[PDB]
Design a protein around this ligand. Sequence first.
Ligand SMILES: *[C@@H]1O[C@H](CO)[C@@H](O[C@@H]2O[C@H](CO)[C@@H](O)[C@H](O)[C@H]2NC(C)=O)[C@H](O)[C@H]1NC(C)=O
Ligand SMILES: *[C@@H]1O[C@H](CO)[C@@H](O)[C@H](O)[C@H]1NC(C)=O
Ligand SMILES: *[C@@H]1O[C@H](CO)[C@@H](O)[C@H](O)[C@H]1NC(C)=O
Lengths: 179, 13, 189
Amino acid sequence: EEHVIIQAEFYLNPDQSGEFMFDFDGDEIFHVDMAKKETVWRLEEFGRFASFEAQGALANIAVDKANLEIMTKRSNYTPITNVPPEVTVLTNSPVELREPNVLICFIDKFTPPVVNVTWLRNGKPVTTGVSETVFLPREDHLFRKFHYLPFLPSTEDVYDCRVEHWGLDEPLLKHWEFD
Amino acid sequence: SAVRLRSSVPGVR
Amino acid sequence: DTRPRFLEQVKHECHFFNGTERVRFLDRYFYHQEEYVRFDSDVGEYRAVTELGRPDAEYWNSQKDILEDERAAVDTYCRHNYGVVESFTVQRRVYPEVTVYPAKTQPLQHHNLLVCSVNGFYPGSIEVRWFRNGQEEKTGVVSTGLIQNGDWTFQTLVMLETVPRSGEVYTCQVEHPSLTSPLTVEWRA
Ligand SMILES: *[C@@H]1O[C@H](CO)[C@@H](O[C@@H]2O[C@H](CO)[C@@H](O)[C@H](O)[C@H]2NC(C)=O)[C@H](O)[C@H]1NC(C)=O
Ligand SMILES: *[C@@H]1O[C@H](CO)[C@@H](O)[C@H](O)[C@H]1NC(C)=O
Ligand SMILES: *[C@@H]1O[C@H](CO)[C@@H](O)[C@H](O)[C@H]1NC(C)=O
């Protein structure tokens, strides 16, 4: 098997969250920002080569919501079982003092697709420059997610990715520091 | 060119 | 928040073999993680995966228009979309940046570990091997495995457990589809 393309959707109650994305071999091609009704390409350049009418995603998500209602009843209101995430913190490239790098917080193998993620520098929340992906599908039908923090490596700062999820009894902190 | 979506189908009530 | 959650997922999958020469469409519906009904182009009708999906299989199979939309999808959906995105996905090639540096199994010791850091490559299939004085070292090799960065690049670290001696030349060798010949990086004690 050479390649797989997947148009993956979900809808979650009672949160009323829906997602729509396309995956190629485990990487996101794009997703639809449901609130803005706009196609968001994972890499900038993708959108120069291709287009997607975001409106069609909204239509599908509406069907998914109706179907969730139906299936919820069929199941006799059997709820999802929380599966807490595995969390790993790593850098984009080998770290050198005062050379711009990126911390990656990889949050894997969890469901439902709801998390609170915070970057901490010296124990304090940081938000400047941060970015994140949507919930990405796994072949076992759990989810994964990436959060990113550009930083200037120094011996002065330590970092943590703090992840909250209903499957965890307390927030999970994964640490990173120089050396 | 345009990516085409696969419709999701309404189930039975 | 302890309110119960309920999740519906749909995955419309296109599977490609030898480009668009052989293509399989798998339309999948899930309640939580449980796949309950699917259309497989190999079959050409919906089948219930669990009892939960029996009503949908039976109804959707009664709707000739739905069935024919599903049957055409290998062409109008899978083959079409492959055409649209293949130039920046299928054909994507990013060569790795390779670095070699010493490390410690314990922060207090001397160096007893060599790291070959392979960063920023696409696609994921890669072969990384260690050589000492031109002979491949296959013992004491350990790795992160293949790591997705989530941004259409991968990385991997491949370690050689060794105590370097003067005179020795170590080489990390990398083979990858973006490369027309092996990329090698030398390190000397
Ligand atoms: C993420 O954090 C928020 C805030 O604590 C939690 O969501 C709820 O926030 C709203 C107000 O913004 C309120 O409805 C609730 O008071 C919060 N939940 C609780 C604790 O009752 C949310 O639960 C957190 N998400 C996860 C997955 O931990
Ligand atoms: C829900 O309850 C009905 C009535 O007892 C039963 O027929 C059906 O099997 C149940 N569905 C389940 C257990 O998912
Ligand atoms: C792949 O396709 C080529 C031309 O499209 C064909 O000649 C070849 O038989 C295929 N490869 C296989 C089945 O090994």
